[PDB]
Ligand binder design. Structure first.
Ligand SMILES: O=P(O)(O)OC[C@H]1O[C@H](O)[C@@H](O)[C@@H](O)[C@@H]1O
Ligand SMILES: O=P(O)(O)OC[C@H]1O[C@H](O)[C@@H](O)[C@@H](O)[C@@H]1O
Ligand SMILES: [Mn+2]
Ligand SMILES: [Mn+2]
Lengths: 146, 146
């Protein structure tokens, strides 16, 4: 029921993005985690433990505090020859960095003929800009293969 | 020295992006061209013939119209494990599509140990969204390798 919402009112959405979401369906049931911080990622599904529409959360290992990095109600997806880029906007706001803008998760999914999905890896966080900051992640998936 | 301009006041830009432009220095002197339209791409240098500050132009072959897809004064650049994404914002405005926003160029540079830079070609144009449209291109470069 609760799935990724694309930019644009019902019917105004990009046919390319709509087609891609449909292609990513086999990933909806999965969950990815990687650990200080523990990042949990899910495709168009609630990864958070607060029912806050979080598609990717960052759990503070010391006290189990959860920060929403991106919400799936603000999804953008597009692909190239052997990769798919997924972007979750609308995360929790920074308190000091990036003009206090909402956090954002950028996931680069590269082609891997050997698995439906694996090797989810947090790559880096860019919080040193006045705007357009982001957390970058990578993962493998045969769905990214063309 | 005229180059790519990053988000933020001169000197106080992301060091991650600054380091990337540095790494891409050997591409500055090159010119890339696609193999109805023809596309010319340049890294931090004028790609057009009308002094418009274009980083990537689209030439309509039948009439010679040069449309600025992206300007190097609005550059964003980041990398992953074996790829680098370069984005030029501030292109010519759409007259009917995408809420008449400025065109945007997204270039995905993949690792290729056999060439400094080659295989630049258009992937697609997303102009069916109410906002956040873009032209997607791909190119190979050993510089994108780790
Ligand atoms: O202090 P600020 O501006 O809230 O920024 C916050 C830092 O907070 C937390 O430790 C995490 O979410 C980090 O990824 C983030 O960089
Ligand atoms: O008519 P609009 O809204 O200006 O959109 C314009 C079309 O114009 C030109 O032919 C090119 O630039 C195309 O890439 C673009 O999609
Ligand atoms: Mn905070
Ligand atoms: Mn136009």
């Amino acid at each position: 029921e609760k799935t990724c919402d694309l930019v644009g009112e019902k019917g105004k959405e990009s046919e390319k993005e709509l087609a891609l979401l449909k292609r990513l369906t086999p990933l909806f049931q999965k969950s990815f985690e990687s650990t200080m911080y523990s990042y949990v990622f899910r495709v168009c599904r609630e990864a958070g433990q607060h029912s806050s529409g979080a598609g990717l959360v960052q759990i503070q290992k010391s006290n189990g505090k959860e920060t929403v990095v991106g919400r799936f109600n603000e999804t953008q997806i597009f692909q190239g020859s052997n990769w798919i880029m997924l972007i979750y906007k609308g995360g929790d706001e920074y308190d000091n960095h990036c003009g206090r803008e909402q956090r954002r998760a950028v996931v680069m999914i590269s082609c891997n003929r050997h698995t439906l999905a694996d090797n989810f890896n947090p790559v880096s966080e860019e919080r040193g800009k006045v705007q357009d900051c982001f957390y970058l992640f990578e993962m493998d998936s045969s769905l990214a293969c063309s």
